[PDB]
Design a protein around this ligand. Sequence first.
Ligand SMILES: Nc1nc2c(ncn2[C@@H]2O[C@H](COP(=O)(O)OP(=O)(O)OP(=O)(O)O)[C@@H](O)[C@H]2O)c(=O)[nH]1
Lengths: 97, 81, 33, 98, 312, 97, 71, 48
Amino acid sequence: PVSKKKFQAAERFLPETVYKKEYLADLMDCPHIMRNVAIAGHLHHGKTTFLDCLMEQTHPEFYRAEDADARFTDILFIEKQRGCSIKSQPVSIVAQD
Amino acid sequence: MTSVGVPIKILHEAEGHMVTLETVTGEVYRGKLSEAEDNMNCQLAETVVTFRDGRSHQLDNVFIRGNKIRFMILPDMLKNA
Amino acid sequence: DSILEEKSRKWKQLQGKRYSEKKKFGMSDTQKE
Amino acid sequence: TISKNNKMMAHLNYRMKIILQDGRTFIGFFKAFDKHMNILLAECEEHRQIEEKRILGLVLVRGEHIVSMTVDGPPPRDGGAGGVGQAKPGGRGMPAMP
Amino acid sequence: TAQRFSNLMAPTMVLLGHEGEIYTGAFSPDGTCLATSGYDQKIFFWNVYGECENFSTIKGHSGAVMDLKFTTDSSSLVSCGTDKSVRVWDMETGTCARRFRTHTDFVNAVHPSRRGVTLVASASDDGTCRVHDMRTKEPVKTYTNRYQQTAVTFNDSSDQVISGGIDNVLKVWDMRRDEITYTLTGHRDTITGISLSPSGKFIISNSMDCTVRQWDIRPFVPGQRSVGVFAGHNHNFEKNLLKCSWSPCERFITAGSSDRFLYVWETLSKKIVYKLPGHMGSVNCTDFHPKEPIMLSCGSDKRVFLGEIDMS
Amino acid sequence: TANGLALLWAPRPFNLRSGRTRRAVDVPLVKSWYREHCPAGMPVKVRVSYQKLLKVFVLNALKHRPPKPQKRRYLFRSFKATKFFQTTTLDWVEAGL
Amino acid sequence: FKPESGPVNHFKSEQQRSQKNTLTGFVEPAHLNEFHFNRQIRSFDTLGYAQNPTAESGTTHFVGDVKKAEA
Amino acid sequence: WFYDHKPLATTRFVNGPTYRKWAFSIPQMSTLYRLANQLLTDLVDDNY
RNA sequence: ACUCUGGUUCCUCUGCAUUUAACCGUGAAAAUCUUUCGCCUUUUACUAAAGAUUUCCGUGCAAAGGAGCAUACAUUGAGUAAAUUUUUGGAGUCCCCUCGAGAGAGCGGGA
Ligand SMILES: Nc1nc2c(ncn2[C@@H]2O[C@H](COP(=O)(O)OP(=O)(O)OP(=O)(O)O)[C@@H](O)[C@H]2O)c(=O)[nH]1
């Protein structure tokens, strides 16, 4: 019955963040602040590991191994195994200038 | 930046939003705080000025010298910040 | 009162030895030297 | 009170009544201050002498204009580990007697 | 079917989790909780009702705990132990609000003031009876006796401190005089515990001579203060400081006993009517729940018993 | 500095400088040799032996199963706890004999 | 506690009438202050007397060469 | 110290006689790296 | 202003090491059940692969207690210590008109 269909990581809870979720959801009402961005690269340039640094700063609980990239935005298990990114994934975070 | 006090930090988070500030001469300015400074100079845009007699007028931009501002009503989401 | 002096002495030894730090709970995992 | 760190952290979040040099009375939950004695009042209201009450938002008062402030009301308000023992129901075994 | 008398889940409960010999146990005055401790040094809190789960446990003691009493408002638990220290535990935080440390030898017995400023009477193997105050490092009063003191209580007005000890006779000190106002004489061996009546008129005192003696501590009595003597319990060669306690209606008195039996006496007749087996060793402490007819007993058998009775 | 930079791409363990310590039975001194490839010149016997050692390594890695979390059965501590066993320091040829 | 009413046998006198559970005796678990129990062995062995272990010991507080206990 | 039985165990480079952790410098690490050479691979491995 | 503790090392106990892409182990054994090839006048012991389960050699961290070696009170968790334009060194007082018994307010006027 408990079919092991799992093909992607999905988090069992909301992880901790430095910002309150309420301040994120309130800032959503204010496009005079918010920005949208895409990060685009040749294969295996910085792009995914750089977002892991933005994750590590906002989250505190975000474990990065000393040996290998965590690659949080590479959620699929094919992307974990291949380690190239294969599909886009979005992040939303509050961050200070 | 250097560690300026929390009220000045909250003032810069108020830059996105509408703020309402009263000047020492009594006029109330409501507008969208486009720049603020650590001396709390304020630049407002899309401004409405309300005079002490209750008349009002629109103003496209206003610069208020920081030491002439009595108080500002900030938006509530900044309480979360 | 001299009997109370003796009883005071007896009580001091008994409670001293009973509670003694060498005998408190959580002790004598004794190392096989 | 303020600046004495053990004391200052407890005087924040009190509901405080602020008197300004124009004679206004503001009331709100005082929850930030600055070396220039600027103060930030959450959920603020004003009382103007004539008394009339008006509701404001989060109000930043530039410190230059404060005369004085006083406590109006308390901050809002709302071991834990064990589990070693167990407590099943039972009964009393009768011992021996002489 | 059978008669029931309390909200207990069963007419007796066996509480297991201790490993040390349990030397003391008391209910919270609100009736929600009880706390128990002894040679394990860990103070175990238990709920009175339902599964009675051990919701909290406080460490921090490093010498075994002689005696343990709640403050009247139930905000704090006061406990003392052979670490020469008196420790006051905040009930909400579970942390040591005060650690009085001026005793020079084992502290065996503790009693908080009933009302006014929170004061803690304490008695010790250094022979001093000391009253501490939450507000000061130094104690308010130190009364020194030549012989070790192992029981203490205030009176209800919290202005006389009654301390008993090796002397068998009782040094009762009046806190405005700093003198013994009177002594209570009848005990042939050391006094293992004293408990003040709910109304404050009387105290019971338990002693190693295997009797509990009831004393009238009211300001005027026209003759001898000995009201009565209770017997039937026993003190064994362990020489424990077996405690005693009052029923909140005063009609019943209890004392610890080395014969494993939970004794209850009727105050006027001094007869026994409850002799409750179930323990496997010396019953060091016994107390009544303050609102409901539940008996607590703590024993050297590492077990705590809760049970309900027909208090008549 | 020149040596420190060279260590960064030394083979493991030499790219570390701080490490947990490992049992002498676990250091498999020759294992990198059979992993990498046969040298072009080595004859029949040795080439076949490289394939057989890869087969053993590939079956070991394929089957694996991660270790169970358990209470470790310390058994020599259980002997040492009883009165019947004593401990002493001995010379390996004495202990062997 | 109230005692069983009526006569008691002449058939089965002072050993056999007593309370028992195992074949000779009432056996029940006990816990004590180990250290004090250790003390009471050592006094009986070295000195000839001990403080009476029994529950409900009554007046018989001590058990041994009572002349030594009093002296 | 190279041929001691448990080398360095009584020194600041390893936690103690349980011999569970080590922290060598670079002068040490480059020297034993150079001695190990005959056993080691040449590769910047992963692509090969 | 408060309770709170000596370093280091070692022993033993207790808890957790299931979200496995993957890994408590940069190493790598054995057994059982079920299933599929090859030896055999018989069974074990076997060949070599899969799946499900165990055992065994190890492992990590945290906490607790104790025991040993050289010895020191600070300090952890809980909290202190600048008069020249934008705040913390007075552009402040007084004297008229208005509403109102009263005392304040009007981008009020003026010395
Ligand atoms: N040397 C070095 N390598 C890095 C650095 N940052 C990332 N890399 C390596 O480059 C590889 C790819 O990193 P990723 O974050 O997956 O790069 P990527 O571009 O997101 O991969 P794709 O987006 O799929 O192309 C990994 O092996 C990283 O270790 C770096 O700062 N220095």
